[PDB]
Symmetry: D2
Subunit: 250 residues, 4 copies
């Protein structure tokens, strides 16, 4: 038949764009969600209606507990269960909020920010590999502004730095098994829904390429390339998709 | 009207694969060469037979000198003369040889060739490209190993480092003009002309992903992505196409 | 009075050498240890015999847990309790072992120790150090020069060391308005593993361009000493590799 | 007896502070200069007043041309003829001005910005290494902001990137001879004399640590460390001395 992909947090925003675009490219997909049951279902609906029985949903909480392992195993599972194979893993799901050094308790923050951002990708990676001709690859959602961090976002930043480390080490380690591991690093994309609107323009104006944020589909485009046969020799690479934002000094 | 691209050192090896593949994507192509007259003319005949009036050649020495700006201006001008437009510039041409710090070319010539082709020509070509200015982009052929260099290749490495700087500086500067500037960084690809079987397998053995060098087409694939509509928010980015080679410790 | 420093995992190897050199430069020192009780007490004994009332020990597991914040707070408080001040924090303590992806400690346990010691505890200690400030304040984080060219099957260790880089940068940024500098020291190959054979040692030694030998503990401490000194008063968010060229050598 | 150090562009500003700190440390110094003869002599006289026969001056243009190799050989020679040895080389001299891609000629700009910042350091490095017959080191003055460049500084940035490559390449190659090679990367240091205080403050306010530029002495302090017995294992390292400026996003 046709290849299959798991996308994490695929309900909304960047994950949904990735999901749809993988589908259009001919992937059967698992739409993982935590909170967005509705949205997951609706997207599955839309993809199933397009090609019969090619989109399934999956619940899991990706916080750092004692049960993350099983959850990550569950997610990889259902991809094999629904489609009998798993070609692609997109690590998209992610928490993001400030954690000031001079001031949810901390370990909540750690489980979410370190847990979702780093540890869960590590576990999914381990399951994806464990259960493996083909074109297998993993794509991690990184952050182009990792070296010029937002003030008071240490934990978030630590977790994204950790994700670069996983990208590198897993690319090395899984290269023998023909599994590629890559990253996509957005700058400013879909801005926080809560963040002010006139405040949003402030950020848009800093971006060299067209004074605007990346659309979700732009991010998705890079993911598509990395999983494709056009990237068959690409592993351990992180592709920034930031419109030049990371090149701009203070 | 199909867009137009200049590829430097497009007569052989990776440059040829980039020109071919731009052509197969719908571009008209200026094939720059220095010495490889026959291969140059040969390729253009092949492109033109495939689609008449779609390929030209343009001879130029890319060694640094007081007339390199005029030679660079001429390469770009050749594209406007042939095709009435210049949409893409691929900085591919490259001198590569050892320049030990501790002891037939003079050092003046070594600097001219290694710094001229790898860095100064790209800069002058970028300047000419932007001056004569849809989906405009420049792709620089960089080097994935530039922070773990070959022993005794200081001038080469300096040139490739300079090219990274050019990639970033021009991406920043040319963004408001809608011109994107990116790089592709091979690890080990098409291997040298003068090298034994034993030595090839030595290098190949180092590559985590499949224990082999990149095909030129694999390198060309990333160039294709960067110039395409799928990369319209990507600028100042360098994509490693190295099979994990740069991840491998001594 | 004399400034005070907290050094984590300071009973042996690189931490001890850092504690010793800070002590010789006139610091009062907290020697944090986990398991190495005899060795920590021995070191403090030596340092106290050198100038009385200048060295204390402090026991803490730096494995991630819900009590890890309390333990890190307690480490910092030990310094204020002993010496009335805390000028320098060195995050040296580190777990180091393989965690293969394609496969005995549970994975829960691996994550707790490798991410906890190498990254979370540094963050918590960073927080406690800064909050307790109410001179030349700085933090030095022991990083790893080979993080972008890692050992096969050391995913979690590498992830923690990359996190520590992120902490170094983020904390340099956030704490600079308080006058606290935050930097890193990144060894290549230094003191080899106690359980490693001399045969394997020489394999690693011969890869080092500068001298074909590992860094001495002193040489690593030397860089730490520079970063805390007034010769580094404008330096923050910098990581100095002390690796003999090792990270420049290709495969 | 006393070790000897060559410092380039040592007449004024940062190179001056380095010469002085090296002298105070016990070094005999060659004060290289291009135009500031008056400045160079006064420094030399003052140093020589502190300690007889410990300081000499040497004039040379470090621009790129067929005579540059000879010039750099002569600079190194001047240390040996004066002091009988050359233990340290500090590549400090630098040209810095904008070179927009869109009243000097372009070839002149290339010659000056690539010549002073990259090529002359390479030639000096070669001459330093070849003339050796303990604690030998080279320190290259880099730039902490090379990945977040000033707009329209492409050539400057290319030169500073090249210098990073030299540092790394020469570190690797000279390590067997026991010559360490490292860099110091200032952020904002001595601001131009004639720059308005109101402008100066715009840059000053960007700096996290103390909201001021680095003194020349602070930069020199990092140089002193790298040449010292405390840095005996450090090679191929670049120490940013930037007060956190490079960590600050747009
Ligand atoms: N937005 C931007 O501008 C930038 C984004 N990025 C990165 O790109 C990726 C996508 O960003 P964006 O779409 O804005 O992300 P969001 O912050 O909106 O989160 C995306 C999804 O993550 C899931 N998620 C969050 N926390 C958990 C958790 N504890 N367990 C399980 N799932 C969880 C949610 O799924 P559910 O809805 O089902 O609960 C949510 O829809 C992230 O990795 C992010 O860090 C990086 C830099 C810039
Ligand atoms: N091959 C590999 O494994 C790797 C290559 N790269 C990079 O990828 C790109 C393509 O590599 P590859 O195809 O191997 O390159 P080649 O070594 O085959 O050279 C490409 C072309 O550069 C041209 N060139 C050389 N000197 C001059 C000069 N003075 N003036 C004008 N043109 C000149 C030549 O044109 P002509 O033949 O007409 O004289 C030559 O065919 C380069 O920029 C290279 O640095 C990066 C790392 C790995
Ligand atoms: N040695 C080398 O070659 C290199 C070292 N580094 C870094 O340099 C630093 C020093 O290296 P090195 O001296 O070899 O380190 P070690 O591996 O010897 O560990 C130092 C100390 O870490 C402490 N530690 C370990 N696990 C825990 C834990 N769960 N809770 C609390 N403390 C713990 C131990 O204290 P105790 O003995 O009391 O149990 C130990 O003595 C480390 O951060 C390391 O990663 C970087 C690269 C190379
Ligand atoms: N100051 C700052 O904020 C920053 C500086 N840096 C780097 O720090 C180093 C020192 O900085 P700074 O003191 O401000 O530098 P300056 O701009 O003051 O230049 C230092 C010296 O360079 C010499 N020089 C310039 N062009 C030439 C040439 N063609 N031939 C020979 N010598 C030449 C001059 O010698 P003379 O006067 O005798 O002609 C000059 O005094 C440089 O390498 C610089 O790039 C990096 C980032 C920031
Ligand atoms: N899960 C999520 N992770 C992230 C990470 C980053 C952002 C984000 O909005 N980043 C922008 C940082 C930035 C920094 C400086 C200038 C600008 Cl215009 C933008 C948003 C999100 S949402
Ligand atoms: N114009 C050209 N530029 C370059 C640059 C690099 C190479 C090359 O062969 N690079 C491989 C270097 C290498 C470094 C370490 C391990 C391995 Cl297997 C290979 C070949 C060329 S040809
Ligand atoms: N807590 C500890 N952390 C670390 C981290 C790294 C090392 C170490 O020995 N790293 C060497 C890795 C290496 C990789 C490639 C070549 C070589 Cl000569 C050495 C040893 C330790 S002990
Ligand atoms: N030879 C010389 N090289 C350089 C390099 C850089 C500078 C300089 O002024 N750099 C500051 C760049 C900068 C960029 C963005 C913000 C801020 Cl406050 C400062 C000044 C000089 S003088």
């Amino acid at each position: 038949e046709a290849p299959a992909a798991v996308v994490t947090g695929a309900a909304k925003r960047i994950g949904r764009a990735i999901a749809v675009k993988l589908h259009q490219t001919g992937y059967r997909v698992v739409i993982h969600y935590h909170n967005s049951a509705e949205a997951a279902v609706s997207l599955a609906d839309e993809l199933n209606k397009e090609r019969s029985n090619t989109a399934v949903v999956c619940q899991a909480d990706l916080t750092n507990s004692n049960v993350l392992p099983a959850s990550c195993e569950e997610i990889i599972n259902s991809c094999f269960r629904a489609f009998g194979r798993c070609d692609v893993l997109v690590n998209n799901a992610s928490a993001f909020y400030p954690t000031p050094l001079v001031q949810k308790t901390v370990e909540t923050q750690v489980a979410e920010l370190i847990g979702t951002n780093a540890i869960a990708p590590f576990l999914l990676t381990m399951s994806f590999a464990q259960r493996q001709s083909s074109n297998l690859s993993i794509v991690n959602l990184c952050d182009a502004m990792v070296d010029q961090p937002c003030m008071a976002f240490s934990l978030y930043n630590m977790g994204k730095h950790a994700l670069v480390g996983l990208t590198q080490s897993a690319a090395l380690e899984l290269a023998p098994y023909g599994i590629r591991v890559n990253g996509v690093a957005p700058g400013v994309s879909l801005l926080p829904v809560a963040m002010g609107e006139e405040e949003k323009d402030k950020w848009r104006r800093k971006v060299p390429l067209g004074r605007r944020e990346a659309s979700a589909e732009q991010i998705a485009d890079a993911v598509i390339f990395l999983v494709s046969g056009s990237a068959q020799y690409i592993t351990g690479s992180i592709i920034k998709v930031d419109g030049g934002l990371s090149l701009v000094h203070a």
